[PDB]
């Protein structure tokens, strides 16, 4: 496991450019924000709904905890 | 210097290299340069000149690199570029 003994690669050509010759942030807001959005659209459907379902169970459970904490109308009413 | 001194006199031996030297010199330099003028410029060079000139063209400069063959080990360009200046 070293550079030279990794694997057999053939017929590939890699064109590169010096970091001083090229830019650091090439088309960052131009090409990026769309690419970021595309990536968000790809994942969102798989990622979000469980956290939404958590939020629903969270607020509901806290709501129902506050309901059960509070008074009830059958506590000695219509019973003097 | 002596390697280059010997190189100039070794190369201009026979007519074809001298005819090349003439034909090339006039297209490039404009005139034919005599061996005495070359020697003047070689004798001009000392240690300080080599350092000032080598450092001018090499030190902290992005180099053009070309690799063909089993080149999995060929260092990354950033590492090559890091090698183009020193620790100092």
From Swiss-Prot, chain A:
Keyword terms: Acetylation, Electron transport, Membrane, Mitochondrion, Mitochondrion inner membrane, Respiratory chain, Transmembrane, Transmembrane helix, Transport
Membrane topology (UniProt): Single-pass membrane protein
TM region(s), chain numbering: 38-66
Positions on the Mitochondrial intermembrane side per record topology: 67-80
Any single GO BP term: thalamus development
Residues modified as N6-acetyllysine: 31
Any Pfam family matching the protein: UcrQ
Modified residues (N6-succinyllysine): 31
Superkingdom to which the source organism belongs: Eukaryota
Subcellular location per the Swiss-Prot or TrEMBL entry: Mitochondrion inner membrane
GO cellular component: mitochondrial inner membrane; respiratory chain complex III
Side of membrane Mitochondrial matrix, spans: 1-37
Family statement drawn from the similarity comment of this UniProt entry: Belongs to the UQCRQ/QCR8 family.
Role played: Component of the ubiquinol-cytochrome c oxidoreductase, a multisubunit transmembrane complex that is part of the mitochondrial electron transport chain which drives oxidative phosphorylation.
Record text on subunit structure and interactions: Component of the ubiquinol-cytochrome c oxidoreductase (cytochrome b-c1 complex, complex III, CIII), a multisubunit enzyme composed of 11 subunits. The complex is composed of 3 respiratory subunits cytochrome b, cytochrome c1 and Rieske protein UQCRFS1, 2 core protein subunits UQCRC1/QCR1 and UQCRC2/QCR2, and 6 low-molecular weight protein subunits UQCRH/QCR6, UQCRB/QCR7, UQCRQ/QCR8, UQCR10/QCR9, UQCR11/QCR10 and subunit 9, the cleavage product of Rieske protein UQCRFS1.
The protein, known as: Cytochrome b-c1 complex subunit 8
Curated annotation (Swiss-Prot), chain B:
Domain of life: Eukaryota
Localization per record: Mitochondrion inner membrane
Assembly notes: Component of the ubiquinol-cytochrome c oxidoreductase (cytochrome b-c1 complex, complex III, CIII), a multisubunit enzyme composed of 11 subunits. The complex is composed of 3 respiratory subunits cytochrome b, cytochrome c1 and Rieske protein UQCRFS1, 2 core protein subunits UQCRC1/QCR1 and UQCRC2/QCR2, and 6 low-molecular weight protein subunits UQCRH/QCR6, UQCRB/QCR7, UQCRQ/QCR8, UQCR10/QCR9, UQCR11/QCR10 and subunit 9, the cleavage product of Rieske protein UQCRFS1.
Family: Belongs to the peptidase M16 family. UQCRC1/QCR1 subfamily.
Role played: Component of the ubiquinol-cytochrome c oxidoreductase, a multisubunit transmembrane complex that is part of the mitochondrial electron transport chain which drives oxidative phosphorylation.
Name of the protein in question: Cytochrome b-c1 complex subunit 1, mitochondrial
Organism: Bos taurus (Bovine)
Residues of the full protein shown: 392 to 479 of 480
């Amino acid at each position: 496991r070293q550079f030279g003994h990794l694997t057999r690669v053939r017929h590939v050509i890699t064109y590169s450019l010096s970091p001083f010759e090229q830019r650091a942030f090439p088309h960052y807001f131009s090409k990026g924000i769309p690419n970021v959005l595309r990536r968000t659209r790809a994942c969102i459907l798989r990622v979000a709904p469980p956290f939404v379902a958590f939020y629903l169970v969270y607020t509901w459970g806290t709501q129902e905890f506050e309901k059960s904490k509070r008074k009830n109308p059958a506590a000695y009413e219509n019973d003097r | 210097k002596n390697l280059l001194r010997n190189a100039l006199v070794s190369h201009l031996d026979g007519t074809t290299p001298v005819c090349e030297d003439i034909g090339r010199s006039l297209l490039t330099y404009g005139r034919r340069i005599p061996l005495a003028e070359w020697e003047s410029r070689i004798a001009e060079v000392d240690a300080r000149v080599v350092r000032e000139v080598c450092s001018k063209y090499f030190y902290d400069q992005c180099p053009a690199v070309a690799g063909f063959g089993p080149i999995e080990q060929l260092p990354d360009y950033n590492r090559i570029r890091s090698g183009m200046f020193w620790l100092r």
